[PDB]
Design a protein around this ligand. Sequence first.
Ligand code: NA
Ligand code: NA
Lengths: 149, 149
Amino acid sequence: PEHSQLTALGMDDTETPEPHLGLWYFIAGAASTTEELATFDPVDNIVFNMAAGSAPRQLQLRATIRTKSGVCVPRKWTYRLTEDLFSSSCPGGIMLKETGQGYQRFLLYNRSPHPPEKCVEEFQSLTSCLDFKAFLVTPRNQEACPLSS
Amino acid sequence: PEHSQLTALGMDDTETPEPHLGLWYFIAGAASTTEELATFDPVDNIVFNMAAGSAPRQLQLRATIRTKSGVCVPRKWTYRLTEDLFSSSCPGGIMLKETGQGYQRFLLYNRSPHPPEKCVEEFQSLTSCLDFKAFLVTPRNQEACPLSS
Ligand code: NA
Ligand code: NA
C-alpha cells in the first residue's frame, strides 16, 4: 500500500478536541514548485475530519471541497503517517508535511474556517524563508460544503 | 563547470561592509540527513572571505578551517550562484542554501565569531520547524586560523 506521507510538524496544543474529532479547514500550502500546489488552484475551501486508518500508521481525511465555481466535491483520502508558529500566530492550527517520491509540500490547517490573517502571514514568511516560495492561500469566499455525520 | 549551488536566503542588511569585503564565520548547518552535514564534524571553526568568481554568477570562499584536533586547513571553494531571523535574532548574520543534485543544507554565517546564542536557537528552531532536523553548531572553542591578506 503506497500512500502519500504525512508528518505532523507542529500544532496549537491548547485547542480542543483531539485531532481525530471535529472539523478542520484547509488554509494554505507552500512548496518549492507551483506543480506541487496546482491541484488546489480550483479550491475555494475545504472542510474535513481526520480519522485513524483502521490499518496501522494510517490517516484518513474525509473532505468536501468547495470549488471556486461553487460546487461541492466529496473526497476520502488515505495517507501513510511518518514513523512559535502555533504558540501565537496560529491558534487552532496544525502544520503537516506531505511527502512522496519527487515531491514535498507544507500544509496549513485550522479549526476555524477564518483564522487570524497573521497565521497565513507567519506560515508564508516561515516557508518563504527556507526557499519554499510557491505559495497558495485558499480564498475561502464561499460557505463550507456539507460533510457526513 | 558543475559547482555546488548557493542561494542567499536572508541577511542582516544593516551590517557593514558589503558581503564581498571583510571576514565571515561559519556558525551552524541544518539539513534533513546527517550525511548532508557530516563533512563539518571535524570542524572547530571557519574563518572565510567571499569574492565574486571572475567567471559570471560565481562565488569563491577562501577559508581556513580550524580543526577540532587544533590544526588549520586552508581552503578555496567555488560555487555557482542561483539565478524576522536577521531583523533581531542574528545581527551580522547571513543564511545561505547550498544545493546540488541529491542534497540540500542551510548554512548560517556571521560577521562575529561568537554571535548571540539566540541566533543559533532561532535558526535551529526555524529549520527544525520545517523538518530539517539534522543540525550542527560549530563548537568555536579555539582561535580562528590565519587567512591571507
Ligand atoms: Na529569513
Ligand atoms: Na513549528
